[model samples]
Target: DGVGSIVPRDLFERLLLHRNDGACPARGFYTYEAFLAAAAAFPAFGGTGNTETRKREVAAFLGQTSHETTGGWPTAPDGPFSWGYCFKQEQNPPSDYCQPSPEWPCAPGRKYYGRGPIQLSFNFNYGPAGRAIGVDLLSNPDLVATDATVSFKTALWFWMTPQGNKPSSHDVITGRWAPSPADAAAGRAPGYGVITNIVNGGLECGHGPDDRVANRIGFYQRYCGAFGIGTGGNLDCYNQRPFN
Candidate 1:
């Protein structure tokens, strides 16, 4: 199987069937073509690691993205877990995410809400991610919402990068990151659990059991099945403390 074929064409399209089939909003905001473009742009993305590792990497990535863009509920049609990718952009969010940063000062008339597959937020992220991907998001933050390729690229960028104090979600999933004494003291270890914290800065990690974390696990299991793999170990981060 080719790297681009990590997620099947039918699987990718139907992943958001609930969203595109009139069940949720953000109709036509995501596309398989854009996924392929973004994946191909990053040479070693889904193509890394062993066979199972490669498969799990894609599943883990999509699983998290599904949760980020989900529009499902317990009583939703076809059940809540199947309602992944329901919305491409955030519906209702904070009033002001801008913070003072002379290096990446907030634009006069821009909003940097969660706007991509992984939902890039705040000005610090917008500036660095744009520069890394060559988009200048500091100037035009809306590109994450308006441009399909750019949107997916930002998600891939986030997944593949080790930002600030956290390891890259890729390293966590690929088993390249071992927790330090601080991390162990914080109750963190390798597994899907650690990946969750790495992706979102331990928001749901140390909080114990929660609906959003459960929802993320729910999506992960679905994708794992889609890829003919198991859910793997340490699936929850309830015991882990945020690196923050």
Candidate 2:
């Protein structure tokens, strides 16, 4: 089974009631079934560990994705935290994200930019993510924005796979990862804070308590707090340096 039983459809829709709002770019884009189908491809996504751990991972994954696609503003109706899944793709990318890579070369006549739930960007990521998830994103990068299942897979694919030196966010939340001595020296601990660093530490982590990190923390707090679970400790990575 997928996350259907774990996350009620109504609750998921309510949380993202505005995902398909009139103004949203990806109106009626994301679907609970698409997420479950994508999560089925990665069993460990929300099916890992026990109930609390699984729930936290689900919450953390959505919290991160919501932040990635958020479109709300301060003092806006229904508040800023309620506007996740509004933008399926990066609307104002400065330039194409085609970067040079040995095995993952960017396709000619194609532009790589943020898309899907994770805002999956850059040709390097597109190549590997597409390869691992059984797609040809390098040639068909538009799938992330067009196919809801593929879009959700990009998010889960990145979340499950580890970066060069970074651990997978799934492992971090599911208790499969721990800090090394080097990590400890840099004040890197466990919890969503570390996940935040892994996601966008280049900007959000090194900087102490800023609005960027504030939005992420706010989403996590909303999900976990509403579900009646704790977000653990180290909710912010102010003391840690972003991974190199």
Candidate 3:
């Protein structure tokens, strides 16, 4: 009953061909019901647009998550791009990713490193996401990795919610976000590329044709092809400045 009704269950499964493979840590974790529930909770994700627009939104969201969790190798079967949802949490994270927030203080002996599909990290992010979704991520961030439903919900929350002057990934992809003067000056235009900038521009954007950006584009193109949608313009953030 979600806005993602356009993306039927069978088609979504086909798009995530390798997400449930044995090699993926999230094997059997990303269920159709979980995704549908999350989508239903955040109606704005698919947008109230035409069928094609809704499909593109799902593709864009999946494409980004696939890149975040891909375990594919260049020589793997069906190409390295086929592998998505490989790992649930970041392996051997260098640090605890603990950033002090006055409003959402981190619990003692808890680490909030990258976890779940979109790799929810940092205290500020966890606090708001938890409050919105009714999960105390600040107290038990590990739930993002341990609970399948919560994991998908966190990813959907990130997708549907805007953060720090950036438009929601859903808005940018669905063509609902109109760039401001600063965005225009930063070369942040509408397209798949700016979506990456919104996600992690400092790390992947403004680097002049980076491989990370390419990986995102590669996943997006493959998913769009699967859904019979064209890969729109501005597929890379090579020249766009990172959003502050």
Which candidate ranks first by lDDT, i.e. highest? 2
Q: Tens digit of lDDT per residue, candidate 2, span 12-90?
A: 8877767888878898779888988899999989888887888889888888999999988997578888888899898
Candidates 1 and 3 compared: the better one by lDDT is 3
Which pairs of residues clash in candidate 3, taking residues 3 or more apart in a chain or in different chains?
none
Q: Total clashing residue pairs per candidate?
A: 0, 0, 0
Could you tell me how far off, in angstroms, the CA of residue 205 lies in candidate 3 after the best superposition?
1.0
Better of 1 and 2 by TM-score: 2
Query: How are the candidates ranked when ordered by lDDT, highest leading?
Result: 2, 3, 1
Worst 10 residues of 1 by lDDT: 14-23
CA lDDT scores, all candidates in order: 0.82, 0.88, 0.85
Candidate 3 local lDDT, 75-180, one digit each (tens): 8788777887777898889988888877888799999899988998888888888999998999999999988788988998988888779988888888889999
Quote the lDDT for 96 in model 2.
85
Candidate number with greatest TM-score:
2
Winner on TM-score between 1 and 3 is 3
Regions of model 1 farther than 4 Å from truth: none
* Over 4 Å off, model 3: 1-4
